[PDB]
Subunit: 322 residues, 6 copies
């Protein structure tokens, strides 16, 4: 227990920092990318999978750039199925179709979005990043890539891809548009949180041990990666503090949370030193839609693990009967 006590976490609502053009920045970003056709493509693949049909996905994300993914459809009688759009943790990528059997086995179509330029840490990826011309001086990793200007910042592109991933999922014929869920843990959680504010198609949010929240506090509290990439950039570029946090404010899950309206299930580990509880609760507490949080007092970044998976299935079942 290195963070605020739980009684204080439950009330923690730090003063939010955002620029006055926060919304306009996102409106312009999405409008510019909507000018390119989504051109979603689903290509059935040869697989040893027997209970699921697997498709190679391609769609246009940020600025028409082609993003890969998987679509896993469980072999069931129902003509329309509910659907989970799944975002991936830091240094991960879409891997193989059989890496994502959980939701299909629970009777949900699952759209897994590959993460541009990552896919080399713990699971392979196939989607490149495409920068806005020059790739500035940065610290190793993604956290500081383009960080001196929100228009060039890496997560501008990722978030836009993620919003478009929902539209691509929605274009698949047996996807029930009334039951599209956006889901992620860690980086995936932070991507999902941004999507829960920017997407018009998402109906529910699953958001575990979210990353990309309350940056200024994160960097103060922990010296773990990936948040430490920002700290290390700041150690060297000592004249850039104000600029760095200005940029980051446009991508902070706390600011997106204040705008999200769809129902949400959060989870948090009180001993999580990768995504500290105070950063997660800051997001949760500002989250503007109907919400619940599962608190795992003795867990680190693993969170509630399989226990939380059970909670997520129960939560959605109940949500989509009401």
């Amino acid at each position: 227990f290195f963070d605020l006590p739980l009684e204080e976490l439950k009330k923690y609502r730090p003063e939010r920092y955002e620029e006055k053009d926060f919304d306009e920045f996102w409106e312009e970003t999405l409008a510019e990318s909507e000018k390119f056709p989504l051109d979603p493509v689903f290509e059935r693949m040869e697989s040893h999978l027997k209970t699921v049909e697997a498709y190679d996905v391609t769609f246009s994300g940020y600025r028409g750039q082609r993003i890969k993914g998987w679509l896993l459809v469980p072999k069931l009688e129902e003509e329309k199925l509910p659907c989970v759009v799944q975002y991936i943790g830091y240094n991960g990528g879409r891997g193989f179709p059989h890496d994502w059997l959980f939701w299909p086995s629970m009777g949900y179509i699952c759209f897994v979005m590959d993460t541009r330029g990552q896919g080399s840490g713990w699971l392979k990826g196939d989607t490149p990043d495409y920068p806005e011309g020059p790739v500035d001086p940065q610290y190793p990793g993604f956290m500081t890539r383009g960080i001196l200007d929100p228009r060039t910042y890496y997560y501008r592109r990722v978030f836009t891809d993620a919003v478009r991933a929902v539209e691509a999922a929605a274009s698949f014929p047996q996807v029930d548009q009334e039951r599209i869920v956006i889901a992620g843990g860690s980086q995936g959680g932070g991507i999902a949180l941004a999507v829960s504010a920017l997407s018009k198609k998402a109906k529910a949010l699953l958001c575990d041990v979210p990353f990309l929240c309350h940056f200024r506090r994160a960097v103060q509290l922990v010296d773990t990666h990936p948040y430490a990439e920002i700290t290390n950039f700041l150690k060297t570029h000592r004249d850039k503090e104000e600029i760095v946090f200005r940029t980051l404010s446009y991508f902070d899950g706390v600011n997106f949370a204040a705008r999200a309206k769809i129902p949400a299930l959060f989870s948090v580990g009180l001993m999580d030193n990768i995504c500290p509880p105070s950063t997660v609760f800051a997001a949760y507490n500002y989250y503007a839609g109907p919400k619940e949080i599962r608190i795992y007092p003795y867990n680190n970044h693993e969170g509630g693990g399989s226990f939380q998976a059970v909670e997520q299935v129960k939560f959605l079942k109940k949500l989509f009967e009401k």
Copy 2:
């Protein structure tokens, strides 16, 4: 690369140490346990799973003691399905049914054996250990529990459970007895290795980064857990070296390997410092059945990860067409 060079690993066949009553010890152990009825129980669960039927399993292992498990049956047309009996890594247990969706998704019935007394490190378990009266002085963990005599040693009970697990799998009506696979990684690999020598019902072996192999070398090469448990016991009980290694000779994967006849797919990570390559290759090189090994030169204990899973599915498909 801390271990022997790959060219030497491929030829590494250290002199084996075993007592003259190795086989008789195992014959008696099995014969005594076979006097208790197996009494396999399969109970269908209420589950949110939609593509798989899940059953709560109970069967009689070592000395009639009741061992838990899961049976996952994928919802397919075929009357008889092939079957994977899955053993679990150190500190793990059967967890939830949805923790084992891989093989069922590939059209295999999957029998997951819970590990007696463990289930508290990374995945919950539900089966206790039942010792042979007194529980001798030991180092924390399972590696030294009862280690001063093979009759009292922990893995005598686990291995017997494991052989009985194959019988329990085989009792299920939808299981094709010609395609029963025994499978495990790490501790699971070592269990499966023992079962490949002791079971009459097993048709194929999947054995990843196996643990419980070449104890004397393991303990001299690495200071990682769980092999360090043995080392720390020896640090204190300095008068017990000979007895400890005598006991471990009855449970060493290399000695079982020299007796196994069924086809096997092994995997090994050359930078694995939990199960060092020399111990894995010792087991592989002595393995007496038709065999292949996948070598992952840059991997630590994670081995081939999902790459190896692809290899396993390809390997069994080809095997069961011949």
Copy 3:
């Protein structure tokens, strides 16, 4: 200094948690063990020791189970001598008679109680544990062994052994029953603290850097072993929090301290990260008999070392003239 400041530690009295049947549970436990005869046996040994007479000890602890120990009697004229009953730290055991020369050299008979099932970490032991039938899923070690029910919990048996050890010591003819001291550091301290509440024969308590105190707080403050064994168990068995802490409440030093009446000398190290200062002071502050504490502000788990030994001799000398 990671824990509360000294001024706050001196007043720290957190709300105690215990079940209504605390006392009854212990009354029954001891009554049930008293139905077996103590049958204490003292067997003089061949030894190179010249200033001390060494005896192999055996006595009946929990439920008649046979516990080992040593009795060390200094060669002195006096026909009745004072006596220290010594309990042992985690992963320790009775070792050799020459591992316990301090108190005999100070003119005290010393009864060293071996610890059931341990003796494999830093000093050898010879006493097994005997469990209550099934040995449940647990994390490696003794902290979580039987932890889902106070009737099955490991320390129920250790504490009962320890109460019976004082009776065994008292049965030795040369022991002055008016000057029997119970003593321990770390785990030994926690055991001695339990004995100070449950024994009728103990006349003074020496309690250094005690372990088994204020579990809830211990587990939140430090990630060191052995308290981390509980945290790790909780990380996995996420549905078992309330049951775990309910069990531990019956064995908590704080709850025993509130019942102990005999005079006591405690010690604490303010930088001790194995047994945190707040857990030790919680115990000391609730301790209901006449008491003193020696505070070592710069020491970690070693506490006052040999300096504290000097204080203990001086404390008992003065106590037993008064």
Copy 4:
């Protein structure tokens, strides 16, 4: 001393691996970049420096891309001065002009080349990278950026910049073109080694504890950064080993060493676990020009530090009289 003994290091000449088109790739790379004008720009700075004039440098490196640097010209009577082209270690950048006072103080003009896209670890930088369209999946850092094809690989661009840096230095009117030295430690040493083979203008090489050498061995020997970035990429992309090492063969200091003709002073620390001695000696031993090496047996990656600085000044003084 974790590497080969010194007697063996002195003889270590592993078999070299390079593609048949090695020279051809470099010839085309340079020829394509030479079609863009160098357009060197030196702009005198307002500075508090009093013994040295400082210039802001800009020149065209790889494919006309604008690279920053500093030029430090010590205030001396001589019309033409000798000149050191300085390359910078991993995660470093050109920093401030006063970060490079050594060579000017010794009477050499110093040209410090900023490193594209780095400058965020231990010294700031101002020069971006400009990738060849898509920036593929990569591990955090620069070592795997574009690694699936030598045409897209990061170091192709760095090396081309570095060759052009020497031409930009040569264009400064006060530079004696007969006494242009190329210099670097670690990454800088590796860049310098490449330039010693590719540049026609360099007259001498200073190469300390070089990085970018004998990749295959580096990655097998040490788990330190930055070589571990390659290992980690390999751990995930298990199907990409052959391609990765193919690509890296075009950038390996050992293969450049075999082609360099200018005189060289190397240094090596025998306890260096960032740049292992065997990788350094492999480069040194294949180095085809007149050469010397200073061996620091007890030093890790810091090498000879200031002692080596003295050696370099003596080395060049003697070289440029002789």
Copy 5:
């Protein structure tokens, strides 16, 4: 961020602890060492340096003991130059003349004082320590050497050397006595702070991430070296706490700060776990001369690095107008 929040650091003025004979102890220490003649010697070196003239220095510090140093003089037309007296961090020594090119390059003469008995960790040294007869039981290092009595304590001799270093620098003919700066980081900073109180010749102080401050707090907040040397000594010698802290009170930068009058530029890293911010601010906040501090919130012990070097050049230029 392990220490007090920045808002509390800016107000942190812990009650100071010093003995009533603090000043007399220092007055006597200096008076006794002033009885030996400074006898400064500057010996021109053969060097490959071309823009600087380098001299081997020797002068008499504590009790006439001969301390080594370097004097680096930039080759400039001006007949009088300003001067920086540079003190060295823990386990360092005077090294080579080319290890100190910064200030000379900025037009300042630079006097680098070698540190008695150290010079074996990250940069070579050539000056021995000469102890007061017996070298008491101590923990490895310099922090507890002679710690049981201020008169025998290692830093008494280092501080005395340091004060005399300024007199040595001042004796060089080109040195402008009106523009003598004392400078250090870490251990150097702590030495410089001491000299700022004890020297009559120093005109300005540069003090980065200073060490030797607020010992009682230092030892309770971090377990890093070198403060952990004291903690470890105390772990063993458990009967010696009061004596140890009494001795350290005579060498604590916070007590010297309360006495310094010369203008000062401080720097601090808020993530510094070698010299914790609360110890640095304690010294800055009690500092009695005109003062500024540069705060680097995201830096550990490296502080402002080259950024701070820029600040220091700007600060002095403005000060000496």
Copy 6:
């Protein structure tokens, strides 16, 4: 197992390096210190000890310098008792009389020599060092204090004290001069080894996990303290290697072993990374007296612990009947 295999350790006899004046250096050193009177003073202490009489010792060691110690005389009828002269490990000191109760309890007088200038790491000391005028530049600790000249080196003074300790012990009336044993572990072991060569009064050697042996190899094999102090000194003073090892040659246990004639019991831990096995075996294999070694294959620097204590008592008992 990081060091040479056991079969090679048993034959390891590396070429010895020593100066031609080795013997003369020691002859002179001892002759000069013998010109001061030993002036041994035993002063009976008030103690709580009841089975042992404790004396405060003071004697003249190196150059008449006054060294403290303890003398512990067990209360026995015998008029003459055998005697153990005990030397202390690095950063230790004489501590309290009750810190050394083992040998008196076994019926031996025990003379504990305090270590000049240490006494501040793990046990308090009371004896200063008194250097030969100037205390040269050094790395923190004792290993490099005065290292640039054998005449100023710290261990010259310690070894001379240690030889004088035996004379001091001999002067006590109840000491049987025919049964004086010199004993130490680690630093104590290296001191004892020196004394076994230099003392004329010593009758047997107990030498555990000895330190101060085969320095050149120690420093190349391990990075642990205290050997690492030398390595660090060398990292900075890069021009001093030859001098440093010249000096250390006069203090190397291997060179003393080659001269010792008294019977000796050694011990060694094969996983000891503070005093590596190859250094210990080098000393043991060159040891010129009758000898035995107890090998503890699985132990670290703790060696045989209490088991070795048993061995030492049995060894001496047998030796002093023969």
